[PDB]
Amino acid sequence: QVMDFLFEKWKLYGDQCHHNLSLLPPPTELVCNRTFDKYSCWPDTPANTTANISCPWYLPWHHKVQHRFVFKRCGPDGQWVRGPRGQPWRDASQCQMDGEEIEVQKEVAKMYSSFQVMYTVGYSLSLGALLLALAILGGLSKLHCTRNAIHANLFASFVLKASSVLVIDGLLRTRYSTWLSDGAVAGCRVAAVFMQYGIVANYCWLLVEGLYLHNLLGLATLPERSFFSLYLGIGWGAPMLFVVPWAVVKCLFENVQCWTSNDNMGFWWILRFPVFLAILINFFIFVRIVQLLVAKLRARQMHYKFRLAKSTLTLIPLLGVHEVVFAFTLRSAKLFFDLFLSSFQGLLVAVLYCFLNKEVQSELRRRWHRW
């Protein structure tokens, strides 16, 4: 964005420094020499005269004020004041970043890194259990059940989300640790559409789990047809209906050095609309199960009611919604309470629906009595 603007303009507005070479005489005859320092464009001046050098507008830190005034003095043969800098440096430093904006520099870099070490230890702890969650649930004999198969691929649809993010954190820093190499520009864009796939492959797969559970209770018996080709098609096919039209609009219309930066909001809502629909529908499904579980608990039991109607309503929305933090520019504390929940959402599904269920606790104890 800003690097894309600055690099072109340094050649375009710096071509006026080459245009200065045409109109100015050779400055060796008791005048100040014009050097290629890529920042100073001082013209020919009389000897021992501090020429006031005007600031160029090519620097992007001059949007509120695009002009400054500082005197540039040099000596007998173009001898400007230079110390540790090998080029002859003029005397102009008031056109830098502002001191009022200097608090945003070198002080928020730990604040981002306070949140950057928060979710990447939560994503790695998520896949640290989710890869074991395939070895426990999917790797053992409980693999042919239709209910188990949605929970198995939802684990894989979090590994596809978690492992794509931790790559794209490490890939984005390692190119930011002569312009940059084009071997990493094409690799960054094919890892950004891979990450944006797994985001939509996560939330739309929660639409599969919500629509499977609502259909399982809407019927009057066990289902005849498993509908598994429909759920695989609506689950992995629908992100490819969205992330591929997102990429081809990104590739030609607003191509930049990496496809993570979102400048135009026109082709960002086309990547939010599968995510926003898979929460709004998965909330109407959620209010139906609460309306059902309040009916099965206020009758035919020896209830303890207010506990088990909230000890399972805590176990739902990790397969359902995190919509309560959507209606509560983002506050630093707010997204801190949101990206903690968004990163650790993949871990909690591995805790509850793969370990704490007694269908495997009776099974894992039997397998450990032998081994």
Partner: peptide, 29 residues
């Protein structure tokens, strides 16, 4: 959906953070 809002902001913050890096080459040498 604040995950996609974060890494679009984290990349755009890291973009212009290279601009002071890059202008350090122009002003010094």
């Amino acid at each position: 959906h604040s995950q996609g809002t974060f890494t679009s902001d984290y990349s755009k913050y890291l973009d212009e953070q290279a601009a002071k890096e890059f202008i350090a080459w122009l002003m010094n040498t």
